[PDB]
Design a protein around this nucleic acid. Structure first.
Ligand SMILES: [Cl-]
Length: 276
DNA sequence: GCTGATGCGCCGACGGATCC
DNA sequence: GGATCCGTCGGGCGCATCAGC
């Protein structure tokens, strides 16, 4: 094994207090998640920015509860045009972004509902639901092409303001990032191809893995557990959800949390504290 | 309108073999 | 002959569509 996330560090290496709290959560069905009180948990966490993945919900079907969030009043939603009930992302913010956009280059023709970009005063935020390689790796080659496209897209963005990338990146980067590495190397989420993609993402953009930066040798720290086989109760999981940061933001990094106890999905929330 | 079946999407438990 | 390796297979949950009434 079980894992207890350590206490929230709220000051930066140079002693500046955190001013920004970002929470990311793959809710695996937004409407279900709300019925399972996920928004009650969000209110307790009181993030400045909330990023949601796999909402499986078009904007017209959003529960009214989402309109009763005074501290997260600026909301942006995206869902795929031809795969309703799959993917879907959202970004909710206390302050209004300067700019918001969707997708990674051609969303207007291939409306996939997987990526939101929001530019703020001091940084650019990207949230993503990266395509799964699929059972039997049936869509691994697509995933590899998508990874390349995404890397190139982010390279452009990071060329201006610093970047924060968060969400479900659908890969456990290294063996320490899942409970059962030995038997899962032919499984979605832990192929050599997906792991290499993540490494290239870090090197090319470039980005740092906030959690692993702070906790380089900490095992059993996961963000996903299959609903099957009582996996969550046994902490047999995978770290699939990340906050990746430009190197220039590392002096602003206070902590990167895994909110293991928060229920309502097969993923748990992750939370970032930055001193901006 | 409402329910429940079906379709689609998205790995860890176990049994047998192998290793010394 | 306990530990490990490795291939096989049984399996939770959400949401869309469909049939039925
Ligand atoms: Cl929107």
């Amino acid at each position: 094994a079980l894992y207890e996330d350590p206490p929230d560090q709220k000051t930066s290496p140079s002693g500046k207090p955190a001013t920004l709290k970002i929470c990311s959560w793959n809710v695996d069905g937004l409407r279900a998640w709300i019925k399972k009180k996920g928004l009650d948990w969000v209110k307790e966490e009181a993030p400045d920015i909330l990023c949601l993945q796999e909402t499986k919900c078009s904007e017209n079907k959003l529960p009214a509860e989402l309109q009763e969030l005074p501290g997260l009043s600026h909301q942006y939603w995206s869902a795929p045009s031809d795969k309703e009930g799959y993917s879907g992302v959202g970004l909710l913010s206390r302050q209004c972004p300067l700019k918001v956009s969707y997708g990674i280059g051609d969303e207007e023709h291939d409306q996939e509902g997987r990526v939101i970009v929001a530019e703020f005063d001091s940084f650019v935020l990207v949230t993503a639901y990266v395509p799964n390689a699929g059972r039997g790796l049936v869509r691994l080659e697509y995933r590899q092409r998508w990874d390349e496209a995404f890397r190139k897209f982010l390279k452009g963005l990071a060329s201006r303001k610093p970047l924060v990338l968060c969400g479900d990146l659908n890969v456990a980067h290294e063996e320490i990032d899942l409970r059962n590495p030995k038997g899962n190397k032919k499984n979605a989420g832990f192929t050599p191809q997906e792991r290499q993609g993540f490494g290239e993402l870090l090197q090319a953009v470039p980005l740092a893995d906030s959690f692993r930066h702070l906790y380089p040798n900490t095992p059993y720290a996961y963000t996903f557990w299959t609903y099957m086989m009582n996996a969550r109760s046994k902490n047999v999981g995978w770290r699939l959800d990340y906050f990746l940061l430009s190197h220039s933001l590392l002096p602003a990094l206070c902590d990167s949390k895994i909110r293991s106890k928060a229920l309502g999905s097969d993923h748990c929330p992750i939370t970032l504290y930055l001193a901006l």
